[PDB]
Nucleic acid binder design. Structure first.
Ligand SMILES: [Mg+2]
Ligand SMILES: [Mg+2]
Ligand SMILES: [Mg+2]
Ligand SMILES: [Mg+2]
Ligand SMILES: [Mg+2]
Ligand SMILES: [Mg+2]
Ligand SMILES: [Mg+2]
Ligand SMILES: [Mg+2]
Ligand SMILES: [Mg+2]
Ligand SMILES: [Mg+2]
Ligand SMILES: [Mg+2]
Lengths: 190, 199, 138, 345
RNA sequence: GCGAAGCUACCAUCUGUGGGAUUAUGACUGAACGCCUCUAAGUCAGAAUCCCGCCCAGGCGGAACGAUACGGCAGCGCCGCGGAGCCUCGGUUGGCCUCGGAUAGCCGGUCCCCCGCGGGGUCCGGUGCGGAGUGCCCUUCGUCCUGGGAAACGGGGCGCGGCCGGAGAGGCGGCCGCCCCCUCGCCCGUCACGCACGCCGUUCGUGGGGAACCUGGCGCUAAACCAUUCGUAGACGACCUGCU
RNA sequence: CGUUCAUAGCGACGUCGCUUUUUGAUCCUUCGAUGUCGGCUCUUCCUAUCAUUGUGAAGCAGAAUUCACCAAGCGUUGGAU
RNA sequence: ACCGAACGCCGGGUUAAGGCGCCCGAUGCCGACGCUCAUCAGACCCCAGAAAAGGUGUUGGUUGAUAUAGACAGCAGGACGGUGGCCAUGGAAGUCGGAAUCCGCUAAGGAGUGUGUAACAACUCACCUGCCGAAUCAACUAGCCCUGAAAAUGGAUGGCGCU
């Protein structure tokens, strides 16, 4: 049936400045700006408290398929506040049996070259999403670090280089090779 | 004596039925900006519908058989032709009356265009449903000129922004003139509001 | 972003139906698309009425959700929705539309002559403002 | 029932409006795309097919068995005299297509270019462009033409140039020169139109259009062969000797319920004289014509750095059914479409 | 026997292409289901599939340009404006334009800031079943005489010259210098207009579109086809050519 | 059944459906006639996919091979009887 | 061959059966209440197409439970001893299988749900606590939609189309 009201509040900390042009929210703070256009999502976005302490999301007269969207708007707002304050750092390890996988960044972290995957001669070039910085970390042998603000862009950039290193026409239960995501955290902890 | 209808946001068959009836009633209708026509049901449904329409073709001579027009204006002409009795002389006269355009030409860009709320997406579809633009549908079926039409519409949106700025300047002159003259048209302004104007 | 809510005490304007063009106090909410409706000083009886044929205004008045016509009549007369509605701009343009519908042919002739002379004077003033703005920008 | 033994189709379904070509000169259907980073240049040229000969050259690719060896190659000589630019034409991008906007011809148009505008040069009075050539030496006419150039520079997106061949320096019988639009691809529209205005009433040689070892496209009309049978036309299987009505025919057209004869069924009709564009032909050499400093210089055509002879590409007795090449030429690896004396893009 | 030319053979030789949407599939974020999840909203990769680019034909489809009948009679096109007379009809004031959202939007100065007088952002203020309203706006649709009041230096001579803008399928509009004339728009006193004696196709866009006669000024001088020839072509037609 | 393990691949005892590419069943059209089988040639179409492109599952370690999906674009030969 | 209705030539009115977005006359009602997303939607006796089975896709109903004596999923300690109990010797200290089938510590392990063994060993499920603190779980059943569901010329709710 149509549920008369589903509400949810997001209490933003004092290090975050958020505002909204209709359903188009913008979140700025320490690490930069992040915008998200919640048009075609069809909810109510109020912003209350002195200096806008909380973001309140309403769904009026919606059945189950649109009651399932209030918490995903709340989750995208939590992820955007986390990307603005603390950022997103995805660690991903190069698992190989015999051939050491050679990973090298080219401009800063934009283009990533992958070599010697299963002894192949074809180099694997991957463009990262705009805003995602790739790096080879220290005190670890073969491990990539993806830093950014947008969890969508960082995790999509991780999925691109995870699906680039796949084993074709073999038993992948035996050939456990590739660059796989091992840790999902933030840049700073606070 | 000529309607100028906008194809922006109007549903395909919902607009085509009203256009077909008003052209059979002896009235010149010019439907324009037909790549802004949206069709209810999402893009894969509408694309497979038009691809099945492309698969329907004459086996022996396809040049003799069905003519599959890719442009959105000619798709709208086809969906009005399927509603008009086009095998008769009055239906052919209705097809001669109807003029359909992609984009909006300089004979019609400087004309006030009409909106049909009985065929409009915000009025007819629920806001939680899906739809598909006929311009994107035509471009991914094979219509060539989405980008040229986009640049020409950008040029005329700049020109219409200049014209609307001049209209706002004329309107602020009109309001400040009414503010200056409302002491000497005191019994000219009152005899309109005692009969139902300006209030 | 909403301002007008279906509240116990909401004053609404009936768009169409039997009591078309009259004010309504919402007493209780029955369903998603049906409300409980009183009309104490607007000649509307207590009945149910759907939300389709009513346009809710920005007037609220205080009475509990099952009032037996007397406390809502007293709240109506205390908040004085009649004079505030007569002072409301939207009812002023509603009665302007009513005067336009009741415009007689002789009245329409007088209105047409007043339109003509008023538009000539305001157009001459607009032309004077245009030449003055040209002289100012010169 | 079905077909017992599966077989591929005789003939191509893409090449079957097989009518005689409405145009005699090979027309460009697709010019290369332009980007405002490279300088302005022509993208096409127009020459006449002269003949065929061998080329012995050194093979220089590794991995092959023919590495560091010598092969012979069948090549085409195409006599390509420098053309004359006599006009420009502008194009605008419309939602109905790509429409021409303004065509500005030159002041001094040669008689070879004027022969194209007439179907009968003898009975004509040679009156073409007589009131158009007066629009250059006056102030108001040159002002209106400069305003037309400015309107083209403002509104046109695609600029093509009008160039015609020189029939004076050719051994052919005809004197009516071929005209052609060539799209100038290069920088911006203003610099493009200024360069075309500079190249107006000028000579365009071959080296300004094409260079060494370039892979180009050949556009031309097929050598016509007449109303041929289906065996010569679609290369179908011949019926055996025991047939009664004929053995160079198609036996079965199709089935009863509709497989009435379609576009896909092979028939007898026109073979040859078809427009064809064939891609990826390598230019081995852009030759140099007969030039005089003291006497004739016949050496620079066919003498290489390994031959060091005094030969030109003209054979003993000249080219068969063409003439004698006295102009600069190109030489393409392979065989091009068309017969001798054929105009070729 | 040998064999020119021409046709001909994977029996010799040359050449044969790139993107977009995505299917299956694998995924990202993330609810429903305070946990998880390719999915419900959204997002990515994705192929002999599909579509287009390449190539072939070019619409009872258009476009730009050139020349347009000087003869031994003639005939055309632009301009200012006069005449009936035939044919075919539709009509019965026009609207000369923002983009845009639908769980929002319109209008101001911009005290504040940025960018190339304008645009954009912040704050504030007025309406929002839209009165800066297509439920809307603009023009009066009897005439002229004379003699007052409110308002106005406005209009006209397809007004003459200049400044321009408009190309998607432009075909129109604004602004200045100069000669002459008029009292037009709103109220009032003053009469007169075949007042055709009740009777229907009134009014007009319209100097409507096509053809035949006529008032003048300027500008002009041909092209196609048949006959001849060619063979890059060909059943005949048709096609490429040459000929003071 | 499969070393254990119903379902990787199979699957009894039962049961539900599709096709007119086989034979049956009927006689509705044709007996003032619709030329009756094969083979040769040639074109188009279907997918119930043998191979090729992209994939998922194996009792897939590699090679080889089975099951399944999108998919008819391109192929499916030369012969003795 | 179905429904309505039987027929001289016409005018006005009213209907049957069917319909009222356009073809095509009429819902151009400010129609009422819900259901439905279909990558094969559905669209009116005969009639021109579909089944068994399945789906937390979504909307209801039936039955039985527990939640302050402090639920459900979510991080977390464990499956011991009579007992290699008992037929199975070819091996069952839970283990291919079957008659058996309870006590003790007790907070708690069923003579056991799997991973797996010539046998073992080992990993690991009832119950509760530390953390979040109010509606949740399980089985049937009826709607609409989806899978099941594959044919040959291009193809038909009549078409256009329709959310
Ligand atoms: Mg393998
Ligand atoms: Mg076969
Ligand atoms: Mg015989
Ligand atoms: Mg792609
Ligand atoms: Mg998917
Ligand atoms: Mg993608
Ligand atoms: Mg017979
Ligand atoms: Mg027969
Ligand atoms: Mg299949
Ligand atoms: Mg044989
Ligand atoms: Mg009955």
């Amino acid at each position: 049936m149509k549920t008369i009201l589903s509400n949810q509040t997001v209490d933003i900390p004092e290090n975050v400045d958020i505002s909204l042009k209709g359903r188009t929210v913008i979140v700025k703070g320490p690490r930069g700006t992040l915008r998200r256009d919640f048009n075609h999502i069809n909810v109510e976005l109020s912003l209350l408290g002195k200096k806008k302490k909380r973001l309140r999301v309403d769904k009026w007269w919606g059945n189950r398929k649109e009651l399932a969207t209030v918490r995903t708007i709340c989750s995208h707002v939590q992820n955007m506040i986390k990307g603005v304050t603390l950022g997103f750092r995805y660690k991903m390890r190069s698992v190989y049996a015999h051939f050491p996988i050679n990973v090298v960044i080219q401009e800063n972290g934009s283009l990533v070259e992958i070599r010697n995957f299963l002894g192949e001669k074809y180099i694997r070039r991957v463009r990262m999403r705009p805003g995602v910085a790739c790096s080879v970390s220290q005190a670890q042998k073969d491990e990539l670090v993806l830093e950014g603000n947008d969890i969508e862009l960082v995790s999509n950039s991780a999925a691109l280089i995870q699906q680039a290193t796949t084993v074709k026409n073999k038993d992948i239960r035996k050939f456990l090779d590739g660059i796989y995501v091992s840790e999902k955290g933030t840049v700073q902890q606070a | 004596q000529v309607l100028v209808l906008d194809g922006r946001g109007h549903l395909l068959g919902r607009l085509a039925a009203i256009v077909a009836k008003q052209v059979l009633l002896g009235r010149k209708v010019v439907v324009v900006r037909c790549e802004g026509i949206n069709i209810s049901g999402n893009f894969y449904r509408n694309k497979l519908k038009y691809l099945a329409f492309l698969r329907k073709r004459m086996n022996t001579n396809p040049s003799r058989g069905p003519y599959h027009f890719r442009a959105p204006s000619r798709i709208f002409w086809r969906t009005v032709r399927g509603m008009l009795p086009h095998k008769t002389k009055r239906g052919q006269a209705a097809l001669d009356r109807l003029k359909v355009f992609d984009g909006i030409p300089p004979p019609y860009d400087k004309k006030k265009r009409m909106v049909v709320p009985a065929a409009l997406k915000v009025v007819r579809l629920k806001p939680t449903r899906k739809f598909a633009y006929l311009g994107r549908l035509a471009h991914e079926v094979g219509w060539k000129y989405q980008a040229v039409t986009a640049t020409l519409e950008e040029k005329r949106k700049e020109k219409a922004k200049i014209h609307y700025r001049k209209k706002k300047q004329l309107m602020r002159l009109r309001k400040q003139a009414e503010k200056n003259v409302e002491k000497k048209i005191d019994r000219f302004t009152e005899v309109l509001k005692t009969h139902g104007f300006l209030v | 972003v909403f301002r007008r809510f279906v509240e116990v005490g909401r004053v609404a304007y009936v768009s169409f139906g039997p009591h078309a063009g009259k004010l309504v106090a919402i007493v209780d909410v029955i369903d998603q698309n049906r409300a409980l409706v009183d009309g104490p000083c607007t000649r509307v009886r207590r009945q149910a009425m759907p939300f389709k044929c009513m346009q809710l205004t920005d007037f609220i008045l205080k009475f509990p959700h099952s009032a037996r016509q007397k406390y809502v009549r007293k709240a109506w007369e205390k908040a004085d929705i009649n004079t505030k509605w007569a002072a409301t701009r939207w009812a002023k343009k509603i009665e302007a539309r009513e005067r336009k519908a009741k415009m007689t042919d002789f009245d329409r002739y007088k209105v047409m002559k007043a339109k003509k002379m008023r538009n000539r004077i305001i157009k001459n003033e607009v032309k004077k403002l245009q030449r003055a703005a040209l002289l100012k920008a010169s | 029932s079905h077909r017992k033994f599966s077989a591929p189709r005789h003939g191509s379904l893409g090449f079957l409006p097989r009518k005689r070509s409405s145009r005699h000169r090979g027309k460009v259907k697709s010019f290369p795309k332009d980007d405002p980073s490279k300088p302005v240049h022509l993208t096409a040229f127009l020459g006449y097919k002269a003949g065929m000969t061998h080329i012995v050259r050194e093979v220089d690719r590794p991995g092959s068995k023919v590495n560091k060896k010598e092969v012979v190659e069948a090549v085409t000589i195409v006599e390509t005299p420098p053309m004359v630019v006599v006009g420009i034409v502008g194009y605008v991008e419309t939602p109905r297509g790509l429409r021409t906007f303004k065509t500005v011809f030159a002041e001094h148009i040669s008689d070879e270019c004027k022969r194209r505008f007439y179907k009968n040069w003898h009975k004509s009075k040679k009156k073409a462009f007589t009131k158009y050539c007066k629009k250059w030496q006056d102030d108001a006419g040159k002002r209106q033409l400069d305003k037309d150039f400015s309107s083209m520079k403002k509104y046109c997106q695609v600029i093509r140039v009008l160039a015609h061949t020189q029939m004076r320096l050719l051994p052919l019988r005809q004197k009516k020169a071929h005209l052609m639009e060539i799209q100038v691809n290069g920088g911006t529209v203003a610099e493009k139109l200024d360069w075309a205005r500079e190249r107006l009433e000028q000579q365009v040689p071959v080296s300004q259009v094409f260079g060494q070892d370039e892979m180009i496209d050949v556009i031309g009309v097929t050598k016509g062969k007449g109303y041929k049978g289906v065996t010569s036309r679609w290369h179908t299987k011949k019926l055996p000797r025991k047939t009664h009505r004929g053995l160079r025919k198609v036996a079965c057209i199709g089935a009863w319920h509709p497989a009435r004869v379609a576009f896909s069924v092979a028939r007898a009709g026109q073979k040859g004289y078809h427009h064809r564009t064939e891609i990826n032909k390598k230019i081995y050499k852009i030759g140099q014509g007969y030039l005089i400093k003291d006497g004739k210089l016949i050496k620079n055509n066919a003498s290489t750095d390994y031959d060091l002879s005094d030969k030109s590409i003209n054979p003993l007795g000249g080219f068969v059914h063409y003439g004698e090449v006295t102009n600069d030429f190109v030489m393409l690896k392979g065989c091009v479409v068309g017969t001798k004396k054929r105009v070729l893009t």
